[PDB]
Write a protein that binds this ligand. Structure first.
Ligand code: HEC
Ligand code: HEC
Lengths: 157, 158
């Protein structure tokens, strides 16, 4: 079980998630979003190893699934490989945890967490309006935007 | 504990399970920003093997036996509920590089670079130094790897 939680079932700030299973990266640069992306700017997304094993067998997110979206800045727009976007420095993380026992009234049993900094002890749980509304509305599978996770789409049975 | 499988002629066999290796960073060179034909289209998701990641945490150096896989994917869209930008589509192919001072004593940095004809190919095709190493040698921040674009590596070294 890769998440740890407070008494009130708040996700403690994940550690070592960069050693979890990467499932996809997207980029919303500030310069293409009126100088402020909602989630600036590169997004590197990870699912915990245990939930990955379960996804390879079921194509479903189990209770205990932790997904971390790590934000990084655009570091440059041209390299020897051509023009585009290339990452810079880390900016922070978002996370979501699915758990029908801890979050029985949350849409999809998912809890969404923001993090004040990489130094924070624990996440801040989010109201449904702030995160779950957009994800339920538009994500291809169980409030996870799998249309942007080719690792997931190719790993499911 | 090495992650590269090789023929007897030291040819790297097509890496399997590298999507469970340690992701070190992602970039994108969209076709539309490169004359409709990027050199490596389009998203690049880069992995380093778990043993060499463990060694990199300790030393900030690539051990003998390092395998790095660059997985290419398409731009699947440019707009999503999160904003405008680039979002990946389907998998396009892989590039790889393997460090080995005994198998590859005459290659710059002892790196062998491999292209792969498709995801079905049994093995890679080792590349001449002109085709890959020359660019990597000449611009990569560290030991022919573009660590300026791998924040995972930079933050994970001592
Ligand atoms: C990516 C995200 C992830 C990664 C898993 C996933 O479902 O994709 C997490 C854990 C997370 N966000 Fe989310 N989000 C949105 C989109 C389109 C993507 C994938 C493409 C990309 O990386 O840009 C996400 C969309 C939205 C959004 C639409 C207006 C809302 C308001 C949010 N997301 C809000 C939140 C959170 C509230 C602070 C939060 C903790 C999220 N998302 C977590
Ligand atoms: C990315 C790459 C990687 C990942 C490791 C790394 O050093 O970044 C591999 C294994 C690989 N390529 Fe290379 N390449 C270049 C640049 C700037 C980046 C990182 C930024 C990005 O992802 O876009 C690379 C540069 C170049 C280049 C400059 C003109 C050439 C000709 C090549 N690369 C050629 C090759 C290969 C020849 C077929 C090959 C097997 C590569 N790269 C592997």
């Amino acid at each position: 079980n890769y998440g740890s939680f407070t008494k009130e079932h708040v996700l403690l700030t994940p550690k070592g998630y960069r050693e979890w299973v990467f499932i996809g990266a997207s980029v919303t640069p500030n310069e293409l979003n009126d100088d402020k992306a909602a989630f600036p700017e590169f997004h590197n997304v990870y699912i915990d190893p245990t939930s990955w094993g379960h996804w390879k067998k079921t194509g479903e997110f189990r209770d205990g699934t932790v997904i971390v979206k790590e934000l990084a800045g655009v570091g440059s727009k041209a390299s020897p490989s051509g023009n585009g976007y290339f990452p810079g420095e880390f900016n922070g993380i978002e996370a979501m945890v699915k758990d029908s026992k801890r979050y029985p009234e949350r849409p999809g049993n998912w809890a969404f967490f923001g993090f004040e900094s990489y130094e924070a002890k624990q996440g801040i749980i989010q109201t449904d309006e702030t995160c779950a509304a957009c994800h339920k509305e538009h994500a291809a599978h169980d409030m996870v935007f799998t249309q942007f996770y080719p690792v997931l789409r190719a790993g499911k049975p």
